[PDB]
Write an enzyme that holds these catalytic residues in place. Structure first.
Site, PDB file in Angstrom:
ATOM      1  N   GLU A 132       0.819  -1.215   0.000  1.00 47.62           N
ATOM      2  CA  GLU A 132       0.000   0.000   0.000  1.00 47.62           C
ATOM      3  C   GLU A 132       0.858   1.273   0.000  1.00 47.62           C
ATOM      4  OE1 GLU A 132      -2.953  -0.220   3.116  1.00 47.62           O
ATOM      5  OE2 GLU A 132      -3.953  -1.936   2.182  1.00 47.62           O
ATOM      6  N   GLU A 239      -6.023  -8.131  -0.083  1.00 47.91           N
ATOM      7  CA  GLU A 239      -6.673  -7.854   1.195  1.00 47.91           C
ATOM      8  C   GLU A 239      -8.152  -7.592   0.959  1.00 47.91           C
ATOM      9  OE1 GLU A 239      -4.968  -4.793   3.592  1.00 47.91           O
ATOM     10  OE2 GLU A 239      -2.893  -5.500   3.373  1.00 47.91           O
TER      11      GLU A 239
HETATM   12  O1  LIG Z   1      -7.138  -0.230   2.351  1.00 46.49           O
HETATM   13  C1  LIG Z   1      -6.806  -0.382   3.736  1.00 46.49           C
HETATM   14  C2  LIG Z   1      -6.077   0.864   4.223  1.00 46.49           C
HETATM   15  O2  LIG Z   1      -7.011   1.929   4.385  1.00 46.49           O
HETATM   16  C3  LIG Z   1      -6.363   3.160   4.697  1.00 46.49           C
HETATM   17  O3  LIG Z   1      -7.328   4.208   4.742  1.00 46.49           O
HETATM   18  C4  LIG Z   1      -7.389   4.926   3.512  1.00 46.49           C
HETATM   19  C5  LIG Z   1      -8.401   4.260   2.585  1.00 46.49           C
HETATM   20  O4  LIG Z   1      -7.898   2.987   2.166  1.00 46.49           O
HETATM   21  C6  LIG Z   1      -8.673   5.126   1.361  1.00 46.49           C
HETATM   22  O5  LIG Z   1      -9.784   4.589   0.634  1.00 46.49           O
HETATM   23  C7  LIG Z   1      -8.980   6.564   1.766  1.00 46.49           C
HETATM   24  O6  LIG Z   1      -9.137   7.367   0.592  1.00 46.49           O
HETATM   25  O7  LIG Z   1      -7.905   7.075   2.552  1.00 46.49           O
HETATM   26  C8  LIG Z   1      -7.773   6.375   3.787  1.00 46.49           C
HETATM   27  C9  LIG Z   1      -6.721   7.062   4.650  1.00 46.49           C
HETATM   28  O8  LIG Z   1      -7.331   8.128   5.386  1.00 46.49           O
HETATM   29  C10 LIG Z   1      -5.675   3.043   6.052  1.00 46.49           C
HETATM   30  O9  LIG Z   1      -4.964   4.254   6.333  1.00 46.49           O
HETATM   31  C11 LIG Z   1      -4.706   1.868   6.073  1.00 46.49           C
HETATM   32  O10 LIG Z   1      -4.252   1.648   7.413  1.00 46.49           O
HETATM   33  C12 LIG Z   1      -5.371   0.601   5.548  1.00 46.49           C
HETATM   34  O11 LIG Z   1      -4.381  -0.418   5.368  1.00 46.49           O
END
Ligand SMILES: OC[C@H]1O[C@@H](O[C@H]2[C@H](O)[C@@H](O)[C@H](O)O[C@@H]2CO)[C@H](O)[C@@H](O)[C@@H]1O
Ligand SMILES: *[C@@H]1O[C@H](CO)[C@@H](O[C@@H]2O[C@H](CO)[C@@H](O)[C@H](O)[C@H]2NC(C)=O)[C@H](O)[C@H]1NC(C)=O
Ligand SMILES: OC[C@H]1O[C@@H](O[C@H]2[C@H](O)[C@@H](O)[C@H](O)O[C@@H]2CO)[C@H](O)[C@@H](O)[C@@H]1O
Length: 304
Positions: A132, A239
């Site tokens: 990620e 995931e």
């Molecule tokens: O996909 C899992 C991941 O999510 C993260 O939050 C993100 C989210 O995925 C995204 O759609 C959005 O636009 O932004 C947020 C962040 O604020 C999260 O931070 C990770 O820990 C997690 O693995």
């Protein structure tokens, strides 16, 4: 028979990221091969094992392995492959090293050569460039995936699949919005798979047991599927998770159903997450009584 691969993440070695190097048994642990064996018995055939770059290769990306951490990690990896399942080696670092975004293709390539050298002959290992990438420039993300591929193949690990991950947390729902440039990646072995992640809560963070609707999963994988098919690429859902309730279970079922209807590009999926330190985590796939084990394992077995 729905997919080529279906299994689960096995977390623990990446825990306590605030403590580097940290202490095994206190800040982090390695996954439990006995519980893993239970999941193999249920029919899962792929296990993704997160770890921290800074604990695996301390101080500098170009440095030497930390023998203790590498041996604890590779014990689990080799347990998984010795049973015939695929094991995904996952630097769980979000495109960052000691908090700073990675910006050196040569240092990253060296890190990956050092690491892949230790699994070069194991054709059941899958390499995951990084978990990620986010809040980084897309040209740097693509360049880092290419550098990882380069280091893996240069080290003589040429039979293993490589899971590449995009920007914006490699989300499936946003793939065509941020990660089209990822199409231009190459591999001397032609074994690239595009790993995307998909959660069903409102923001896609996967931090809630509530989903948007009974249909949000399929809706959130349509565009990524079309991209894979259009560009002749392969994908895997590295995931995914849903809460212990009927709406989330229907949304997961619909999403997996869509992916299986498009299994020509979708090579499978891996639940988030199993592992021994989750306690009553909302998505725990760890036996004997993780929430997701009890509510979801029988549902997932229908795709095995
Ligand atoms: O996909 C899992 C991941 O999510 C993260 O939050 C993100 C989210 O995925 C995204 O759609 C959005 O636009 O932004 C947020 C962040 O604020 C999260 O931070 C990770 O820990 C997690 O693995
Ligand atoms: C690793 O997983 C195994 C299997 O779940 C754990 O063993 C169980 O431990 C409980 C302790 O009360 C026993 O009652 C069960 O009979 C065991 N189950 C089986 C099937 O072996 C083990 O404790 C775990 N180890 C760690 C370090 O968490
Ligand atoms: O749950 C306690 C555990 O959390 C670990 O971080 C988790 C996070 O809670 C979860 O939302 C995300 O999906 O996974 C990460 C780990 O990959 C944390 O690292 C541990 O210190 C903590 O004990």
């Amino acid at each position: 028979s729905s997919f080529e691969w279906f299994g689960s993440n096995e977390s623990g070695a990446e825990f306590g990221s605030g403590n580097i190097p940290g202490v095994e048994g206190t800040d982090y642990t390695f996954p439990n091969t006995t519980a893993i064996q239970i999941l193999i018995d249920a029919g899962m055939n792929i296990f993704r094992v997160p770890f921290l770059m800074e604990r695996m290769i301390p101080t500098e990306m170009t440095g030497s392995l930390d023998t203790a951490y590498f041996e604890g990690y590779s014990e689990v990896i080799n347990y998984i492959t010795g049973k015939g399942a695929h094991a995904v080696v996952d630097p769980h670092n979000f495109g960052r090293y000691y908090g700073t975004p990675i910006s050196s293709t040569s240092d990253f390539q060296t890190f990956w050569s050092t690491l892949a050298s230790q699994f070069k002959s194991n054709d059941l290992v899958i390499f995951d460039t990084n978990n990620e990438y986010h809040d980084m420039d897309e040209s740097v993300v693509v360049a880092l995936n290419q550098a990882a591929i380069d280091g893996i193949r240069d080290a003589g690990a040429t039979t293993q699949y490589i899971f590449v991950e995009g920007n914006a947390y490699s989300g499936a729902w946003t793939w065509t919005t941020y990660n089209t440039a990822m199409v231009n990646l190459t591999d001397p072995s032609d074994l690239i798979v595009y790993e995307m992640h998909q959660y069903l809560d409102s923001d896609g963070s996967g931090t809630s047991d509530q989903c948007v609707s009974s249909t949000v999963g399929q809706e959130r994988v349509v565009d990524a599927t079309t991209w894979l098919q259009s560009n002749g690429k392969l994908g895997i859902l590295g995931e995914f998770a849903g809460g212990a309730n009927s709406v989330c279970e229907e949304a997961v079922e619909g999403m997996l159903d869509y992916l299986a209807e498009n299994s020509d590009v979708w090579l499978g999926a891996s639940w988030w997450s199993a592992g021994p330190w989750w306690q009553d985590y909302i998505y725990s796939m760890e036996p004997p009584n993780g929430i997701a084990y009890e509510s979801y394992l029988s549902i997932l077995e229908t795709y095995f």
